[PDB]
């Protein structure tokens, strides 16, 4: 699905077309913004520390592990998504890449089956 690339400060560098469809923000709008704009509180207010923490401690909590989290669209609606984060480097600087898998349908089908 969506692909997002951020620098070591959480600023969006690349935003794929699928990402635009999934999150509602366009490439130009998202580029130059903190990745925290795609998530809700409390994570939103702590995400920077999350990244900050990893840069010194070097202890992966998600990198190479993957996790299902809640994403937030521009219109404020939240949805579940699987996220895998990869670490890379360019220009001697660190970059993080996130691969997103929308699980909205999976969750809806599950809730519906649970309801019937």
What's the closest the beta carbon of residue 103 comes to ligand HEM, in angstroms?
13
- Looking at the Cβ atoms of 61 and 110, the one nearer to ligand HEM is 61
Task: Point out which residues bind ligand HEM (CB under 6 A).
Answer: 4, 6, 35, 38-39, 43, 47, 50-51, 54, 60-63, 69, 71, 83, 85, 96-98
Annotated binding site, which residues? 47
Burial (CB count within 10 angstroms: exposed 0-12, middle 13-18, buried 19+), residue 48? middle
What's the closest the beta carbon of residue 110 comes to ligand HEM, in angstroms?
20
What's the closest the beta carbon of residue 40 comes to ligand HEM, in angstroms?
7
Residue 35 has a CB neighbour count (10 Å cut-off) of 23
Per-residue tokens: 105: 């349908």
- Positive or negative, the CA dihedral 5, 6, 12, 13 is negative
- Looking at the Cβ atoms of 50 and 109, the one nearer to ligand HEM is 50
Exposure on the CB side of residue 97, measured as CA atoms within 13 A = 11
């Amino acid at each position: 699905d969506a692909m997002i690339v951020i620098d070591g400060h959480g600023i969006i560098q690349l935003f794929s077309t699928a990402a635009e469809r999934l999150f509602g923000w366009s490439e130009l709008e998202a580029i130059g913004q903190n990745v925290n704009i795609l998530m809700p509180e409390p994570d939103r207010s702590r995400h920077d520390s999350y990244i900050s923490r990893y840069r010194t401690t070097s202890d992966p909590h998600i990198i190479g592990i993957g996790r299902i989290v809640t994403g937030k669209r521009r219109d404020g609606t939240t949805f579940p998504m699987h996220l895998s984060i990869g670490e890379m480097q360019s220009g001697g600087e660190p970059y993080f890449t996130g691969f997103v898998r929308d699980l909205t349908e999976h969750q809806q089908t599950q809730a519906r089956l649970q309801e019937l």
